[PDB]
Symmetry: C3
């Protein structure tokens, strides 16, 4: 899809700085994913520097994977600062639905407003439920997008992305991603780079297609978890116009 | 050994959720080790969600590698919650004997009760000493198991595992593991998966044999630290009945 | 250069313990870099064990990449403890100049005294400016070294290291390092190992040459970010006298 190739080019030409207030398991992993793609990561959470860092950044990615009271304070404050400045925010509600704490904090951030909400079926369904696979996943994506007035992506074998009016289905990816931790978190981080250079719906769709293709390419070279993980970074770096043209599996729905 | 092949099969069929309250150096590393083996990891420490997360989990792994007062509180509380629910607990006393703080916290957790205590000679000897290589390592393993009323593993060139009555010696492994950080921590995390599906003595022995074989297989493919580390995950995923049958080096002692 | 080959040999013969109070993104990464080189890492920050850990260590590496009020307290206390004991300190002012918080904390640590200050042009220039490319980088390195009464390294395409009286230029390295996060942090950690066995100027210069060569060797084997990252550890382990003799690009300036 044309806007995907152009978005990737924009990310690499502009080299956006993506501020991550993320979890301990994906600190290095999402930073390297961003660098491989062509963006620049910065991980910071101290309330003493949140304003200056978010001012410096082009986008903010919030990941609650390993949150606690201290990080929650930083994440909520960051959301308020980013919204005041108009810096796009990407939220990955890791574990929402698993514990009330995660569901509560996710809704708290969503109440203030984010630009992209990205999670799996269970996480997004839990958020929409508390607040109030294909056809059902598509409906969930749309309802959540309207409910939270933002662009939502419900990831899965087939990913669905919607801003409430338009919807895209992404078929790229590989099941071995299930054996590498924080892959959805990598997508959230990459989305941060794309949203810095293009609107939310196209940015998130572009992130899913790009990462999904990288996963397919990585598997071609490595059939096992360890080597496969390494190849993900290789392909986030190597993916280009020709690869997207030949591997992209995405369509607009409805 | 037959119970090892069966334990591995059980881990992969049941896909247990292993809750880790661990150290910053091994967050990603132990999560990916668990995923490669066939289990599911979850890293969480917030006191606001410990009960719900431990309720969700099938086993709890505590690693004090980078502890502080805040994490200590979470670890002790987790131990009390897990014991009330009957969820097996694996403790890796990283650095016990190196600082009083680590020795103290380890004994505090052991006093409440764990199902598996796993560490090297120095760590376990320090715990047994404060509380109160082969032949000496074997005796240490046994005395510690009776002292702390649990299954203990003293890792080394040859690993010893004992529940106080029975003891096993594991000869699998490779010295290059000494050049990859947190490998013992990987074993503790994997033990969490095994203990969710089989009793402590067999679970820990199975974890040591499985990881030890993965280390041997990884070295066959990679002779240097970086590439060797990557291959560990590949083999935790590839190891199967035939590999265990042909590579396992384990025997019951006494 | 002869003192580099000898320093590397000393690191591997003595296997120094390098205490790191570092950032979340480089926890595993710097630990494995140290192990590959031949040193032993230990990551600890709890005020309850700082004294015992620094007493145990041969050098202390402080990295403010993901600091907060809690870690700042630990870092400042560690600096005071290390100086009282005479344990060499390496400071990597990650992000100094980006936020006042990072600049402030860096200067606070520098005021108490460190043995090696290592950062890029922007970070060191911000510290020297607040306190008060080649020719300019060289002048910066020298002025900063005299200003902070320590050995300073301003990293870049060409690295400059000076203790205020003597200066060295390092030409080794590869641009792909820009696509792997925390590479400068890896150098700071390695410097911790070298400074434990040789004086600051030679230790830092040796660290830059060794890592720079590892980068060149890694690129020869891997042209993409993921695989390249893995090969860095392989070569920190494989580099030896012959490789240094044939690849080293370093000279004393002035």
């Amino acid at each position: 899809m044309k806007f995907i190739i152009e978005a990737l080019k924009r990310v690499r030409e502009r080299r956006p700085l993506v501020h991550n207030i993320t979890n301990f398991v994906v600190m290095n992993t999402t930073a390297n994913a961003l660098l491989a793609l062509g963006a620049s990561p910065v991980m910071a959470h101290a309330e003493e520097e949140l304003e200056e860092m978010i001012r410096l950044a082009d986008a903010v990615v919030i990941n609650i994977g390993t949150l606690d009271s201290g990080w929650r304070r930083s994440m909520v404050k960051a959301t308020e600062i980013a919204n005041e400045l108009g810096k796009p925010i990407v939220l990955d509600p890791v574990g929402a639905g698993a514990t009330k704490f995660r569901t509560r904090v996710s809704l708290e951030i969503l109440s203030r407003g984010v630009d992209v909400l990205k999670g799996n079926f269970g996480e997004i369904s839990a958020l929409l439920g508390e607040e109030g696979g294909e056809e059902e996943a598509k409906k969930l994506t749309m309802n959540a997008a309207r409910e939270f007035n933002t662009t939502v992506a419900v990831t899965g074998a087939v990913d669905y992305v919607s801003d409430g009016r338009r919807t895209f289905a992404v078929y790229n990816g590989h099941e071995l991603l299930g054996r590498v931790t924080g892959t959805g978190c990598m997508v959230a981080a990459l989305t941060g780079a794309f949203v810095a250079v293009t609107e939310p719906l196209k940015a998130t769709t572009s992130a899913l297609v790009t990462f999904g293709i990288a996963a397919e390419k990585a598997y071609e070279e490595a059939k096992y978890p360890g080597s496969f993980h390494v190849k993900l970074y290789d392909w986030l770096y190597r993916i280009n116009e020709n690869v997207i043209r030949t591997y992209a599996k995405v369509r607009e729905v409805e």
